[PDB]
Amino acid sequence: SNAMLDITTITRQNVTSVVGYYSDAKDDYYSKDSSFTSWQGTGAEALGLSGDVESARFKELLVGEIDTFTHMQRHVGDAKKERLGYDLTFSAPKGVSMQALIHGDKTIIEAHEKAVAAAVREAEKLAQARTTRKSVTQNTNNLVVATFRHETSRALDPDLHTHAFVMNMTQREDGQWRALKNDELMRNKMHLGDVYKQELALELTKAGYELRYNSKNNTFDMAHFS
Numbered sequence: 001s002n003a004m005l006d007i008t009t010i011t012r013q014n015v016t017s018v019v020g021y022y023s024d025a026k027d028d029y030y031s032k033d034s035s036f037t038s039w040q041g042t043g044a045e046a047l048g049l050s051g052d053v054e055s056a057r058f059k060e061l062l063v064g065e066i067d068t069f070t071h072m073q074r075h076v077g078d079a080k081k082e083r084l085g086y087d088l089t090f091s092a093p094k095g096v097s098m099q100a101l102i103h104g105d106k107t108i109i110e111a112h113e114k115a116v117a118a119a120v121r122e123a124e125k126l127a128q129a130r131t132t133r134k135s136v137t138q139n140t141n142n143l144v145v146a147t148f149r150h151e152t153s154r155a156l157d158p159d160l161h162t163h164a165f166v167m168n169m170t171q172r173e174d175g176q177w178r179a180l181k182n183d184e185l186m187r188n189k190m191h192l193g194d195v196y197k198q199e200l201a202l203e204l205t206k207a208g209y210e211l212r213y214n215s216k217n218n219t220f221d222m223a224h225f226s
């Protein structure tokens with residue numbers, strides 16, 4: 001999309017809009033044997049999730065089904081107001097997208113996903129859960145994230161972006177899965193967008209690409225493709 005980083009809170013009210021909600025019945029995976037989807041976050045690893053995202057499992061975690069015997073209770077009032085997670089959508093600059101999608105440059109795609117992954121690692125630092133010892137807020141440093149890459153390869157305004165869906169869950173010290181306290185995540189949108197931006201530029205520069213910096217806005221794009 002147009003925003004460098006958009007953050008969309010998913011609830012029961014808007015869940016059918018979330019990336020990954022729909023799937024083809026004949027397939028277990030949206031994109032088996034590719035990197036269009038991936039599980040990320042230390043929480044994902046704690047759940048034994050890695051590699052391609054299985055659609056059924058994504059949908060279970062969306063609504064807090066850790067397993068058949070373990071359904072999260074994330075409610076304090078109206079049932080439709082339950083937060084299911086947060087879509088952190090990272091979109092590449094226009095020239096970067098054109099190089100990736102029109103010129104078919106796989107290096108760019110790799111750089112973009114490394115940049116998303118770095119921003120996800122930063123987001124993890126903001127993971128928190130409420131505990132009772134007296135209410136106590138615990139830094140848990142783990143998220144469960146399902147990423148979906150979208151390659152809008154239209155000649156008119158190519159758009160490379162990845163939806164990094166952060167589940168509304170985090171594993172506490174006691175091993176218990178609880179809802180994320182999203183305060184820190186929410187107030188760090190600009191910071192996370194800049195982590196993605198800086199890391200993307202670093203990766204492209206390392207790979208040898210010439211970038212053009214806009215000094216007024218402190219942004220960048222490809223030197224010849226913008």
Ligand SMILES: [Cl-]
Pocket residue numbers: 018019020087148163164165
């Ligand atoms: Cl999504």
Ligand SMILES: [Cl-]
Pocket residue numbers: 113114115117118
């Ligand atoms: Cl990375």
Ligand SMILES: [Cl-]
Pocket residue numbers: 180181182183
């Ligand atoms: Cl919250």
Ligand SMILES: [Mg+2]
Pocket residue numbers: 035036037038147148149162
């Ligand atoms: Mg992905």
Ligand code: NA
Pocket residue numbers: 092093094095221
């Ligand atoms: Na742009």
Ligand code: NI
Pocket residue numbers: 150161163
């Ligand atoms: Ni999309």
